[PDB]
A paper describes a structure:
Direct binding of [name]-Pik to the [name] domain is required to activate Pik-mediated immunity. However, the stealthy alleles [name]-[name] and [name]-PikF avoid interaction with Pik-[name] and evade host defenses.
Crystals were obtained in several conditions in the Morpheus screen (Molecular Dimensions), and X-ray diffraction data were collected at the Diamond Light Source (Oxford, UK) to a resolution of 2.15 Å (Pikp-HMANK-KE/[name]-[name]), 2.05 Å (Pikp-HMASNK-[name]/[name]-[name]), and 2.2 Å (Pikp-HMASNK-[name]/[name]-PikF). Interface analysis performed with qtPISA identified 15 hydrogen bonds and nine salt bridges between Pikp-HMASNK-[name] and [name]-[name], and 16 hydrogen bonds and 11 salt bridges between Pikp-HMASNK-[name] and [name]-PikF, compared to the 12 hydrogen bonds and eight salt bridges mediating the interaction between Pikp-HMANK- KE and [name]-[name]. Inspection of the structures revealed that the side chain of Glu258 does indeed extend across the interface, forming direct hydrogen bonds with the backbone of the effectors.
Author numbering:
A (entry chain A): 187 to 197, 199 to 259
B (entry chain C): 33 to 113
C (entry chain B): 187 to 197, 201 to 262
The structure:
């Protein structure tokens, strides 16, 4: 049931604020954390998160977004 | 109060900063109010009932603070720390 | 340079509170913590806890600072 998802997003000013708000407010999300030296990957932990819709939203609203990891 | 006998605090370790070594447990009249994590050999500010209390930690996660009447915050090391 | 802040928030209000905290300048992470998911733990740089509490009360509802701790790096 418990999921860890890592997405690389293209983030240009207030892009972190905008991407973090979107992921943070996605259904099933418990935690969001910027990782990597450039803080350009988002680690998402929760239950029942739909990774396909998360990637759609991020691509529509923020920029290029690649699924790097899905773990359960 | 036996801390060896308390459910583990629900926690999230931020991956960008070191993992805090201690669990802490806050009680009003021996009744658990709140819990979380903190660093060893360090310091934090905590809202303890009505007052902000400066709490100091030693390397063993023992917590000293001037707690208001009826309140205490007690620390211990997390598994394998 | 980093600080950890824990906030009790009466809290979809969880999604609203998380979105507000996560949007703050200098945020590294935000997490719903506690068994009731009734606390937000924020880590980052140049976060003013007073300003964050004001934003939460005006947007989401009752909110109280619980813990403020510098990162031991």
């Amino acid at each position: 049931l418990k999921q860890k998802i890592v997405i690389k997003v293209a983030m240009g000013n207030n892009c972190r604020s905008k991407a973090m708000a979107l992921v943070a407010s996605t259904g099933g999300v418990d935690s969001v954390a910027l990782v990597g030296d450039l803080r350009d990957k988002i680690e998402v932990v929760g239950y029942g998160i739909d990774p396909i819709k998360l990637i759609s939203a991020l691509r529509k609203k923020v920029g290029d977004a690649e699924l790097l990891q899905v773990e359960q | 109060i036996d801390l060896s006998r308390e459910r583990d605090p629900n926690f999230f370790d931020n991956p960008g900063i070191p993992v805090p070594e201690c669990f802490w447990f806050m009680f009003k009249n021996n009744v658990r109010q709140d819990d979380g994590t903190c660093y060893s050999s360090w310091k934090m500010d905590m809202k303890v009932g009505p007052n902000w209390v400066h709490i100091k930690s030693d390397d063993n996660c023992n917590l000293s603070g001037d707690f208001p009447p009826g309140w205490i915050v007690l620390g211990k090391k997390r598994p394998g720390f």
